[PDB]
Structure 1
C-alpha cells in the first residue's frame, strides 16, 4: 500500500516514496525533525505553544471599536497591517509547487502556466480509499450531498450586511483569475495572468485586447445608448462572447470576459470599469499631450490595477472580514520583508471561492422584483435601468450567509454539485489535512465541525470519518463565526491565498511602485486614493447609494 497514503510527514514535510514499500519525509526547513517531521526545535515548540487561537485573534479583531479606533490612528495600524501581510503570505509557496500533472516539483510545473497549482499533492491513485486511508470506499453522491446540506430551504441572509453590490463585485473580480479551461479539463486555466491583470476588462489575450481597443487617446471602444456609455457591440468590436444562440451580435456587448455577458450584475461593473479606464486616459492625455495610444493605454491599465487592488483590500476585504483594524494598501509595508512579487492560482483557492450562497432568492430592482428567469440573460436590464439605478438596488439588497449550510438557491445548486465532482477528479486531499496545512487543528468529529448534532450525525453515516470529510463541503458546512458570513477555515485558508495574490503583483514591487509608473503624481494618487464610491460616482451622471454594506 502506498505509505504516502497515510500522509505520514507532518508540518509540511514531504513524503517521498522509496523502494517498493518505504518512504521518507523531507523535513527541510520544516521546523520539526524526526521520521515524520514531528519533533520540534526549541524555538518552533516555543513559537507554537504561545500561538494564540485563530478564534481568539478573530475575537480581538472584532471588538473594542473604541480601542481599535485609537489604534487605527496610531502607527500600530501599519505595524499590524504589515504583520498580517507577512505571516499570512507565508502559507502560500513561491515559486509554485505541484500541479494536476505533478505531485512533485518539476520544471514543467514551474513553467507551464496553463496549469492551476495546488498546495497539497493529490491523494495517490493507489491508496485504498478515495481519500487515502480512511472513510468509505465510495464517496457521498454529490447530487444528494448537495441536496441534503447545501440546498437553501429558507434564505438566511449574511449578518455582516453584505449586499449584492459586493456579491457581484466578488463574482466579477474573481472571474479574472478563476477561468478554468473547458477544452483542457479541470486544473487548467485560460487566465494565464494568475492574478490581478485586469484581464476581464482588456481581454485574456493580445488579439482580444486589440479588438476591444479604440486606438485613440488610449481608449477602449464603447457605444452610446440613451446618451450614456456602455461597452461596444459584438458587431462593432468582433470579439468572442457567450450569449444563448439567437441573440444577435448587434444585441451583444463585447467585453473581455466572454462569460460576463449573462448577468446584468457582471455587465454593470464591466461598464463602470470601462468608463473608468476611458476617463483616466483623458487625464493622462492632459499631462502628456506628447503621449501615444499605447503609452496612454498601457499606463491607464497600470492605474486601474492600482485602483482595483486598493478597493479590494481597504473596502472589500474590510467588509468581508468585519475587522475593526482598518486594513491598508501600502506596498511599502513590504519593502522590508522577503516577499516574492509573483502569484499562481491554486485549484484549492478556486474551490474555496465558490461563494454561490451569496446569491438571493429574487433580484429586487426597486418596486420591481425580478426572478432568476428574468435576470439570468436579460440583455436589456442594464441599459434599461442605467448604472446608477442598478447600483443603488444591488447596494441595498442583502446577500445570503456564505458558510452555515443549506443556503444555496436551487437555481444555481448544480454548480455546487459540479464543484464536488470536480474536486474528486483533482483527487483533492481531505478537509482535515488542509485544516492542518493552514495552521489549524483537525476536527475530531462531525459534531465539532458543524455546530450541531443532527446533520453532523448524517454526515457521519455518509462519510464515515471526519478524516474523510471533503474540502468544499467541509468549508461550506463548518460552523460560522458568531455573526460572520462564514467560519474559521474559510478565513484561515482563504486569506493567505487572497493576500499573497494581491501583494504579489509586479506593481507592488519597489521597482514599479514609483510614481513614474503611473504617469506622475496624478495617476499615482488615483491609485493611492480609490473608492468604490468614487469608482461609480465619477462615472455616473448622479451618485447613488454605493457600498458593500447594505444601508
Structure 2
C-alpha cells in the first residue's frame, strides 16, 4: 500500500496523519480551512483569499511609487507598514519549532534537542514511489550534471541592484553564526546551538572557547598590535581550535570565534572589525560604570553588539537586498502589541536557501592588484598587509554577482552547490512547488513558467520529467529574477519569513529585555539604536574609507 501522505493530500498546512493500514486524515486545525484535505475556506479565509493581492503585485508597489513612498516614509505610515511587514511574514514560521531530520511529527525530543536543525514541511516519506514523492523519475538528475549545466557560471553576471563584495562577505560571516553543520553528526545537525544572532562566531559557541578568547580584564577580548593597528590574537595566547592550513600555526594564525574564519581575508576582516568594536564598547561602558566587574563589562558589551548587528542587518543589509522604497526599520516595540514568540531555531530549508555562493566574483581587485582564488583563498597576510581601511574600500567597490537567474556560480566553488543538491536529497526535502505553496504562493505549472526563458526550461523538463518533481535548491536558483532584482520571487517570499522571525525573535528584542538597563546605561541603548555599517568601520579604523552594501556610482 502506497503511503498516502506521499501525495501531500492536505492543503494549507494541514497535518497529514496515517490512520490504519491504508488511510489518512488531515488535521486542518487552525488552517482556516476545513474538509477532507483542508480545501473549504472558512467565511473569513474566503474573504481574505479573495482580497489578497498577488505577491508579484505587492513587490510592484514596494518598488515603484518613488513619491508615495517618500511621503509614506516621513510619517507613521512607515511604522504601520513595518509592523505589518514583520507580523504577517513572521507568522509563517512555526514556533515552538516542529519537525527535524529525525521526526516528521511533534515530539518532546524535537522541541528540546537544540542540535537538530528544524524543518517547515515534513520530509518525503522513506517509502514513496518517486524520490520526491509521487511525480518525477525513479532517479533525480545527477547533481554534478544539473550543476555544471545550469548553476555553473560562464560569463560573470553582476548584480543589477548594485550589491557589492563588502556585502558578499558580511553576508557570509554573519550567516555563519547560525549555520554550523556538524560533520560528525552529519547533515541536519548543527554545532551552532543558540540558533540566531548571538554572535557565537565572535565569542565562540562554548564557554571554554569563549574564555580562551576572553582577556578577562575590562571585559575585553584578546588582541595583538601589528603595524600599530589592532587585530585578533593568535593561538599563542588564544589557544583555541582553528583551521588554518598546516604551515605556520604560530603567528598570523589568529583565533576568532568562528573555527573556519581564517580561510578567507573577508571573514577574518570582518572578524577584526567586530572584535575591535566590542573592546570599544567596553571602553565606553567602563567609563560609565567604574564600579563594574569583568563579567558585566563583557556580557553588556556583547548584547550591545547583538543589537548593533540586528540593526545593521535590518536597516541596511535587508534594505539593499529588498530593493524596496519603503525604508525598513528596526524597532522591537513595533511588535510589543502582537502575539510573538521570542525564540528561534534555524531550519534546514533556511540553510539551503541561504547558499548564495554566486555572489562571489571571478577575481578579487584590491586596488591596482587583482588577486585570484589561489592568491586569495587561505592567503594569510592580505589582511595585515593591506589593512582594514584599505581592504574594506576594496570590497565596497567591487561588485558582487546576481544570485538568481541561473548559471552564475564561479567554477572554483561550484562544488558547494553540488553538495547542497546532494544533501537536500539526504534530508529528503519536499519539491520546490510544495515549498512554494507553504510560503503563500502558487505552484508553477511549467518550467517555462518557472524560468523566464525557454532553453534551460525545456532541458530541465527533459530531466525532472515533471515540474512538480523539481527540487528546492535548484528551483530557487533557476527561478526568474524579479526585473533588475538580485534574485527572484521565491527567494524573498521564502527567505524573509525565516529571516525576520529570527531577527526579531532574539531575546534582546522582547519587552522584558529591550530596556536601557540591559545595555547598561542610555549610552548602550543608543549604540544599538543608531548603529551603521559606516560607523562599525570608521569608528575602529584610523581613517574612513568608502563603505556600503552597494557599489558607488
TM-score w.r.t. length of structure 1: 1.00
CA shift for structure 1 position 235: 1.2
Task: Indicate the SS of the match to 1:411.
Answer: coil
Say yes or no: does 1:278 pair with 2:272: no
Q: How does 1:113-512 map to 2 (within 5 A)?
A: 113-512=114-513
Partners of 2:316 and 2:189 in 1: how far apart? 31
Instruction: Compute the displacement of 1:236 (Å).
Output: 1.5
SS of equivalent to 1:17: strand
Ranges of 4+ aligned residues in structure 1 off by more than 4 Å? none
- Deviation track 1:158-194 (CA, whole Å, cap 9, x = no partner) reads 0000000000001000000000001001000000010
- 1:33 positional shift: 0.5
SS at match of 1:23: strand
Shift of 1:49: 1.0
- CA–CA separation in structure 1 for the residues paired with 2:329 and 2:289: 30
Q: Which moved more, 1:210-219 or 1:246-255?
A: 246-255
Provide the C-alpha distance between the structure 2 equivalents of 1:151 and 1:50, rounded to a whole number of angstroms.
41
CA distance in 2, matches of 1:203, 1:293: 18
Looking at structure 2, the residues matched to 29 and 95 of structure 1 have their Cα atoms a distance apart, in angstroms, of 15
Aligned counterpart, 2:92: 91
CA distance in 2, matches of 1:521, 1:168: 31
**1:474-529 CA-partner distances (Å, limit 9, x unpaired):** 00000000000000000000000000000000010000000000011001100000
Measured in 2, the distance between the counterparts of 1:248 and 1:185 equals: 28
Matching residue of 2:39: 38
- Higher mean alpha-carbon deviation, 135-144 vs 239-248, is at 239-248
What's the CA shift for 1:248?
A: 1.9
1:244-284 CA-partner distances (Å, limit 9, x unpaired): 12232323100000111110000000000000000000000
Residue 364 of structure 1 and its aligned partner are, at CA, apart by 0.2
**Which SS does the other structure have where 1:257 is aligned?**
coil
Aligned-partner SS, 1:24: strand
Deviation string 1:181-238 (CA, Å, 9 cap, x unpaired) is: 0100100000001000000000011100001100010000000000000000111100
| TM superposition shift of 1:243 | 1.1
Partners in 2 of 1:234 and 1:548 — Cα distance?
32
Structure 1 distance, partners of 2:342, 2:250, is 40
CA distance in 2, matches of 1:291, 1:111: 35
Show structure 2 runs of 5+ residues with no match: none
Describe the superposition over 1:401-428 as per-residue Cα deviations: whole angstroms up to 9, x where unpaired.
Answer: 0000000000000000000000000000
Aligned Cα root-mean-square deviation (Å): 0.5
d(CA) in 1 for partners of 2:255, 2:529: 30
Which structure 1 residue ranges, 5 or more long, are not aligned? none
C-alpha distance in 2 between matches for 1:267 and 1:2: 49
My pick for the range that moved more, 463-472 or 240-249, is 240-249
SS in 2 for 1:224: strand
- Paired residues in the alignment total 551
TM-score where L is the length of structure 2 = 0.99
CA distance in 2, matches of 1:394, 1:107: 46
2:29 is paired with a residue whose SS is coil
